[PDB]
Design a protein around this ligand. Structure first.
Ligand code: HPA
Ligand code: HPA
Lengths: 276, 295, 263
């Protein structure tokens, strides 16, 4: 509640460390935490089968909530943690419950980089569904009412795009974190554009802030899954109106476009973790 | 927490359903819920006298909370009147504010929400006494965590992720202007963006200026949480704002101005809001009375 | 809940009023409450030694969470509080004395206007209550009707005459430190894009204080004079692209010292 949180963090670390003590023949000290958001659902298959990876369900780790698992293993030669299943503020969870896995994993003392992906709506007018955005700055709107993105890791991400011959666009710009769970209205998207937003999403920024608070480097990659509707709605005086449902955002579209970009995103992250 | 507003919603649904069952000879399936905000306090007198309308006090409905539900026929159509609404600046949560919408949704007949409210004019072309038909909104508190859908999703009502670019039905807005011409109403009816702020303070000049550049046409203290909840239930929405005052947006008098305009000039007041809402009430009454017959 | 909040306000005033009676020979009716922000707490040295000032720790005042200083400075009786319903409970408690008419609040603020430098002063003549627009508001809940209105205007929050007074006192005191007139944006919890957004919204200085106290004082009918100390210029320019190769406290002290004598 006030200090039970710290005991909960210590308790979860005791569990994870003791499980890493039984599973791995040698000391497993992960250097990267990969929050497998959109586009990273299948990167767990890129974990090496040997040494056999350790899979911890959230139900057994103290403090970890559900409504999820931790994967400890080697990817591209480097030891990493993948957390499949993330908590969101719009689901009712508190900010502490959302970033509790990061604070527990930080007690291992070996992780020094957070790599996180998420879906995002395109606010920048030149953005198209299917593009990626490397985040170099953010606006925390919920934090407003109650850099941080490592330059070398961003340089590294673009070098791996060239090395892998990935044709997919990867922009640079600002990511606005909003609470959700509603998609933005037309006037809200226009406001976000005026505020300097390039893409908008409802996750990631709280984990980034906690990761920076723990001294970790951060690399954040947004998947532009849709282009936010910005045009004013059809006037009642228009005899030939554009239907107000045309181009509406949809979770099915977010899911489909996340999966379409997953092969490129997983290849980029797999190449990056070898040089963390 | 999801399991106990579900229990509260279903409990409130039966209490309304059972007393709709005893009161009306023919079963009462209302087409619309009319939130009687500013300009609609008197529309209860437009309810047809037969069949006998049913009035349910909030104090006797589980989960609810001045305040009553009026079940009757208006211009031939069965409706529910929300006479008295909960505001968030009074300390109530958003879940308590929109709980009547979810409970009334279980009647399975309502597919349109008609809601009015008072609003300060941010658009410079707006005058006190004008009306604004809402076709878009800015939910700035929702962007920052003050959202009526926060928490576990009511999967039986709507999707976890809800679009709002289609929030304000076009056919209902055209029907509203069609009734303005039919009734020969000369009052101005604009079409613009409504911004929901928490209150209970009136906006400072810098807050009104910020809302203006953000794209606001009129700023109010209610409605948007109910519109979002109704849209989550799949309802069509017709929102109508009453421009009760013109927001002070010019920067305040500077200390080095030797011909300063008094900073207290044109300040907003609750009495001006009340009196302008009353003056426009007859027009708003007539408009909603005609619209309900064609929803 | 308001019933218990009302009793705690009365208890705090009943304690404060009783202590003023025992301490001061002549009855003490303070005319201004001066809130001393961080780094600007040394203003307590500007209170006259005679009559003897009264210092009440917050821990001794019922309902409070720092110290309250009751004394005379420049001949005027004032209250100094050295250091959301909790934050403004002291304002409503002190209002029950029936004498305070002015709130003078000072704070440290980050510079959003590009023309500001660290060390500059800014006289607040407008604010943006971001938390209040979203739900974190000092007046949320049942209204204190005995204190003020359910709906309060904020377009007349920063008294013009009190601002004209401050500027007059700077010329008199030959203070050369620049004093700007601008908007203070209140944020509860910045990035370059966040600082850029504030500038686009009309922010001249940003911080996490002042505004809730200003609203509560305005709800009580007080006049408000707000002064900000620019401690740093918030960076606004975007970060590098992956493709490229303390003396002001005495100045504030002199200003408040000269202002309180002619409020
Ligand atoms: O349009 C959007 N809005 C908010 N969050 C999102 N996440 C993916 N797309 C979107
Ligand atoms: O100026 C206003 N601001 C906010 N809400 C309002 N409701 C009526 N007028 C106003």
């Amino acid at each position: 509640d006030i200090n039970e949180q710290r005991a909960l963090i210590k308790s979860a670390h005791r569990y994870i460390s003791e499980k890493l003590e039984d599973h791995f023949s040698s000391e497993f000290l992960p250097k990267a935490l990969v929050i497998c958001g959109s586009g990273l659902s299948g990167i767990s298959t890129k974990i090496a089968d040997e040494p056999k990876p350790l899979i911890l369900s959230y139900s057994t780790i103290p403090g970890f909530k559900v409504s999820g698992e931790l994967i400890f293993g080697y990817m591209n030669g480097a030891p990493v943690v993948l957390m499949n299943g993330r908590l969101h503020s719009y689901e009712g969870h508190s900010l502490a419950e959302t970033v509790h896995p990061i604070r527990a994993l930080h007690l291992l003392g070996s992780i020094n980089v957070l790599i996180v992906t998420n879906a995002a709506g395109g606010i920048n007018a030149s953005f198209k569904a299917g593009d990626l955005m490397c985040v170099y700055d953010h606006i925390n709107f919920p934090g407003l009412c109650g850099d941080a993105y490592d330059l070398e890791l961003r340089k590294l991400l673009f070098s791996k795009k060239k090395e892998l011959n990935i044709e997919r666009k990867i922009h640079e710009g600002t990511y606005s974190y909003v609470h959700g769970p509603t998609f933005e209205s037309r006037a809200e998207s226009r406001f976000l554009r005026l505020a300097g937003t390039d893409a908008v999403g409802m996750s990631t920024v709280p984990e980034v802030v906690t990761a920076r608070h723990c001294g970790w480097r951060v690399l954040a990659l947004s998947l532009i899954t849709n282009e936010c509707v910005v045009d004013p709605p059809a006037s009642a005086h228009d005899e030939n109106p554009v239907p107000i449902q045309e181009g509406k955002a949809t979770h099915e579209e977010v899911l489909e476009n996340s999966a379409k970009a997953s092969k490129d995103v997983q290849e980029l992250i797999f190449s990056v973790v070898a040089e963390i």
